[PDB]
Design an enzyme around this catalytic site. Structure first.
Site, PDB file in Angstrom:
ATOM      1  N   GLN A  44       5.546  -8.462  11.047  1.00 16.69           N
ATOM      2  CA  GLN A  44       5.646  -7.223  11.385  1.00 16.69           C
ATOM      3  C   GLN A  44       7.135  -6.972  11.975  1.00 16.69           C
ATOM      4  O   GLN A  44       7.450  -7.536  12.836  1.00 16.69           O
ATOM      5  CB  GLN A  44       4.798  -6.383  12.387  1.00 16.69           C
ATOM      6  CG  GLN A  44       3.212  -6.662  11.860  1.00 16.69           C
ATOM      7  CD  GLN A  44       2.285  -5.795  12.404  1.00 16.69           C
ATOM      8  OE1 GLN A  44       1.232  -5.509  11.766  1.00 16.69           O
ATOM      9  NE2 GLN A  44       2.790  -5.341  13.592  1.00 16.69           N
ATOM     10  N   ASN A  64      -6.526   0.100  24.160  1.00 10.13           N
ATOM     11  CA  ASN A  64      -6.849   0.634  22.945  1.00 10.13           C
ATOM     12  C   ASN A  64      -7.877   0.530  21.932  1.00 10.13           C
ATOM     13  O   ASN A  64      -7.843   0.453  20.859  1.00 10.13           O
ATOM     14  CB  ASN A  64      -5.434   0.758  21.980  1.00 10.13           C
ATOM     15  CG  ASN A  64      -4.721  -0.613  21.900  1.00 10.13           C
ATOM     16  OD1 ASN A  64      -5.488  -1.505  21.787  1.00 10.13           O
ATOM     17  ND2 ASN A  64      -3.451  -0.727  21.619  1.00 10.13           N
ATOM     18  N   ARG A  83      -5.729  -8.639  12.570  1.00  6.62           N
ATOM     19  CA  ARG A  83      -4.227  -9.211  12.428  1.00  6.62           C
ATOM     20  C   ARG A  83      -4.221  -9.598  10.928  1.00  6.62           C
ATOM     21  O   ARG A  83      -5.194  -9.659  10.270  1.00  6.62           O
ATOM     22  CB  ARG A  83      -3.828 -10.475  13.255  1.00  6.62           C
ATOM     23  CG  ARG A  83      -3.872  -9.852  14.644  1.00  6.62           C
ATOM     24  CD  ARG A  83      -2.354  -9.444  15.057  1.00  6.62           C
ATOM     25  NE  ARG A  83      -2.115  -9.055  16.192  1.00  6.62           N
ATOM     26  CZ  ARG A  83      -2.566  -7.966  16.914  1.00  6.62           C
ATOM     27  NH1 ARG A  83      -3.253  -7.078  16.269  1.00  6.62           N
ATOM     28  NH2 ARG A  83      -2.187  -7.808  18.176  1.00  6.62           N
TER      29      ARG A  83
END
Lengths: 399, 399
Positions: free
Chosen positions: A313, A146, A284
């Protein structure tokens, strides 16, 4: 063996079986010439929702038909979660960065049968790499799956912050017009200086997408790019991150998380940015000190902050980045668009096929193997643990 | 003489005297080599809010020191507006597209002293060009002032629609995480086919910005681009708009409004798009039949619609595009970012200096002069009136 696969919930209105479009676009290869994933076969239809519990990464028929047990769950945070009941005999643990099962040193220590931690996506900082090294766990992730998707998301957020999209859409949907209210903070990016921290697969791709906007491009990184590349994009090199920030109207972070980059953006380093700089972070969340970013926005040091990554998260419901002034946040979604999930679902299967037939896992997928960094891991990560504080994810409540 | 200058309101919280950043970026020239505006002087500071009533386009000191009267107002729509009291002796009328004073045939007929209708910005379809031709009104606009700004706004909305930005930011600010809800309609643009209607200053610039995203580029227009350009961007040409639509995942409209393009996108032409195509329109709202777009979104024919232009402007409070499914609308703001206003404020003064000293106005600024189309107007517009229905703008109420 047993495989625990941690995935995010299905949509709040159920799991759909039909989508806005009929197929995905063709892609033959990645820019540096890496081949796409090559599993011997796939059992999902490209374009479907693969990363939620009902999608399963399309791995069930394959895994069972070979004797293994697949446990799928979204329950991952906290002392009485489903991940926690399954650690004792898990041979393989799979999670995505968007909904990461944090494998801390204590969790690896409870996991006697654990041989492979697999990241479906990119960025394996949610596993304690030191503990993985010490216990001979293999750590792999799906390189390049990705990279381009993340680069698109960066440009989208740069344009959105700078042109002031989000507040302007609000005026349209609440029935206003309010031109002056919208453009009081609206600039063009044409002519601005933008720098990237790191110029690997994502950061080089970001530079190439911003070139025809006639921005002045700046970068920093461990090593220089080839002189062919610098002259093609007319790049200005900075030997350190800290020298770059003062030269830039727009800064984008595109480096890995490890002890050398943890909290690099803090009250002290923010003093080095131009007044009214823009900061975008899809790398991040832990690269930034959480409260230092809210102070810089509140003081005008930053004109805007945007990103899709948070720490931990999921981010607690009252995480301050949700409501701070001038933000274009989303939850962690850049590397899990439908198009990306099909490449990472395929790569995940390719790694599992290798694992289970006793063939070597591609070097470009390797992060940790046999007691040290390996493959991509060696060029990108330091030994160390980034997962401290991760327990706070248990405070998040579904709406 | 008298100059009426119609501008939009100041921000709801007052007119600011300081901004998110300190200066604008340097720009030396426009891509086709056109020089920036060259007034003999400017009286505003670059970067300020110039397009609202308190900014005045920085024209007051200049105009008065030369004997003329400057009337500034935002009151423009309806039979008892301020524009309407000042038509009888106005020599010059100035408005921007974002907040356009509609000079219909009846308004020109009430305006015996009117010699110059000036557009501060680009797109003069809010003046009845037939009536302007018949009454020997000069019509000029500020060519290139915001061409690049509009092109940025297009790419921003293409990425935003396709990656699903707006609903995802909502989940972040309302306290959710909701990954599957966000990416259920999230794709990458990599590999998609995108076409532009017209490839002039805006549309060619859009093609160049989308090239490094590895989209497949398609265009249509009156005439072909030079074969050098087509081979540089690997372009696929379509001899008509209607053949282009079926070949495209993403369509962007970048042509002028005149009777030949009014309502070109309607129930009949929408049948030609791919199912789940994306449509972006920052050209003019009247290019689209208003209700046909809401039906296509409701049926899935379109996966998404985005734009910043509406008809009329301001759009009534209950205009359906405000609340239709899958939209990324803003009010009309692309060509009035702070950066653009400084170029158009300068160009407006340059046209006024020429007018008042009896020098010729640059050809590239001319739309109508001496009983016919002229300059840029001749290559772009047909004789005709686009301003029917414009009265409905009087229904809009400030919040």
């Amino acid at each position: 063996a047993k495989v625990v696969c941690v995935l995010y919930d299905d949509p709040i209105n159920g799991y759909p079986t039909s989508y806005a479009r009929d197929d995905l676009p063709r892609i033959d290869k990645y820019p540096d010439g890496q081949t796409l994933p090559t599993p011997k076969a796939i059992d999902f239809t490209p374009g479907a929702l693969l990363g939620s519990v009902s999608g399963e990464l399309g791995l069930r028929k394959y895994l069972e038909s070979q004797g293994h047990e697949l446990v799928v769950t979204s329950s991952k945070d906290g002392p009485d979660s489903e991940l926690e009941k399954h650690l004792h005999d898990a041979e393989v643990i799979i999670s995505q960065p968007f909904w990461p099962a944090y494998l801390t040193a204590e969790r690896i220590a409870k996991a006697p049968k654990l041989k492979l931690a697999l990241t479906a996506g990119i960025g394996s900082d949610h596993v304690d790499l030191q503990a993985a090294i010490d216990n001979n766990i293999t750590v792999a992730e799906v390189t390049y799956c990705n990279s381009n998707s993340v680069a698109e998301h960066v440009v989208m957020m740069v344009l959105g912050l700078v042109r002031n999209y989000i507040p302007s859409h609000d005026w349209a949907r609440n029935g206003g017009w309010n031109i002056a209210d919208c453009v009081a903070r609206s600039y063009d990016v044409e002519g601005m200086h933008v720098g990237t921290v790191a110029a690997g697969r994502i950061g080089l791709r970001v530079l190439r997408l911003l070139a025809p906007f006639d921005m002045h491009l700046h970068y920093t990184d461990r090593h220089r790019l080839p002189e062919a590349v610098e002259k093609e994009l007319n790049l200005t090199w900075h030997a350190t991150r800290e020298d770059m920030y003062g030269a830039c109207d727009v800064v984008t972070l595109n480096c890995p998380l490890h002890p050398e980059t943890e909290h690099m953006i803090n009250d002290e380093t923010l003093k080095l940015f131009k007044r009214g700089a823009y900061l975008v972070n899809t790398a991040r969340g832990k690269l930034c000190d959480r409260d230092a970013i809210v102070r810089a926005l509140e003081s005008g040091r930053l004109a805007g902050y945007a990103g899709d990554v948070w720490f931990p998260q999921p981010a607690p419901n009252d995480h301050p980045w949700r409501t701070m002034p001038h933000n274009g946040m989303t939850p962690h979604i850049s590397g899990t668009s439908l198009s990306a999930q099909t490449r990472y679902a395929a790569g995940t299967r390719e790694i599992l096929e290798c694992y289970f037939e006793g063939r070597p896992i591609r070097d470009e997928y390797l992060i940790v193997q046999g007691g040290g960094l390996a493959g991509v891991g060696a060029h990108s990560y330091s030994k160390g643990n980034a997962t401290g504080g991760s327990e706070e994810a248990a405070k998040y409540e579904k709406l």
